Amino acid sequence: GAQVSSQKVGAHESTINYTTINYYRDSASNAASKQDFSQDPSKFTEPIKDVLIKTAPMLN
């Protein structure tokens, strides 16, 4: 049940990996993976009904 993931190696001395085994039944007990996703800011930066083309006039 071991999970093997790669580290993003910053300062250097192949891929360096690290290992993780969950010891508990409850997922709440797990550490944080930090394997997170990004999204586009559009729902906040461009919430307009008609798609914005930045080279065009915003008002036409």
Binding site: K49, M58, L59
Partner: protein
């Protein structure tokens, strides 16, 4: 479009009501989510919902207010502002639970010689600060819920010193967005600006937002509408200009659960 279509010219139709505009600045859909009915996978009350459709999902116009050089700003809460609006209000007070989205259309025209800019903000959970420094969280239900008349912002915090019979109302200071955070940051909430040289209206389409799929509309407001003058009204060289601001709001995809006898709230 070469056939004449414009960002500035829109028509909105819901139920037996239509809004037209010739000076829009496009329109906003809050968080990119259009209103929707509650899906079965997210459903919670099991009884058959009531869905009034055109009887309630139509444009209701609230009482017109007036913008002047001394105006500090206005606020309304939803669904509260619509609690007395035709069959929407009836459906609301007859049911324990209700959920709704909204099309909010703020109207304010002037002339090519007037100037000023209104920030129109839709805020989820718009908790406002109270008038008291003797008791926190003390604003009464009646004062928290003005209905369609709404409330106003002030440039000055003034604490209620009557300890014997406290006012128990909000004291929402404008540069602090009525809630202790700076107004210049209110733009992270879904918004539009009515800048008189550019546009004469704001249109915000609001999804139902909450930490629950459905809730008590009578106990809880989901959205707050806050309108503040970002740039003050001005005209020619008149010292006391005035232009009206009208709010028209339509419920969208509203559904209700838990039917019983009607709620008769203490509102004064």
């Amino acid at each position: 479009e070469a056939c004449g279509y414009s960002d500035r010219v829109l028509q909105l139709t819901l139920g037996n009501s239509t809004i037209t505009t010739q000076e829009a600045a496009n329109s906003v859909v809050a968080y990119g989510r259009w209103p929707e009915y509650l899906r079965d996978s997210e459903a919670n009350p099991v009884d058959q919902p009531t869905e009034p459709d055109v009887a309630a999902c139509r444009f209701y116009t609230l009482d017109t207010v007036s913008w002047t050089k001394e105006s500090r700003g206005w606020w309304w809460k939803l669904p509260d502002a619509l609690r007395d609006m035709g069959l929407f209000g009836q459906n609301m007070y007859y049911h324990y639970l209700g959920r709704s989205g909204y099309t909010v259309h703020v109207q304010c025209n002037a002339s090519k010689f007037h100037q000023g800019a209104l920030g129109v903000f839709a805020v989820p959970e718009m908790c406002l600060a109270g008038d008291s420094n003797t008791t926190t969280m003390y604003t009464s239900y009646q004062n928290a819920n003005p209905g369609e008349k709404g409330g106003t912002f002030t440039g000055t915090f003034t604490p209620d010193n009557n300890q014997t019979s406290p006012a128990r109302r909000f004291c929402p200071v404008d540069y602090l967005l009525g809630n202790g955070t700076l107004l210049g940051n209110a733009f992270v909430f879904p918004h539009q600006i009515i800048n008189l040289r550019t546009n004469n209206c704001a249109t915000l389409v609001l999804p139902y937002v909450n930490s629950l799929s459905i809730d008590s509309m009578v106990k809880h407001n989901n959205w707050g509408i806050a309108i503040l003058p970002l740039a003050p009204l001005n005209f020619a060289s008149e010292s006391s200009p005035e232009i009206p601001i009208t709010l028209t709001i339509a419920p969208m995809c509203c559904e209700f659960n838990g039917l019983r006898n009607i709620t008769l709230p203490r509102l004064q």
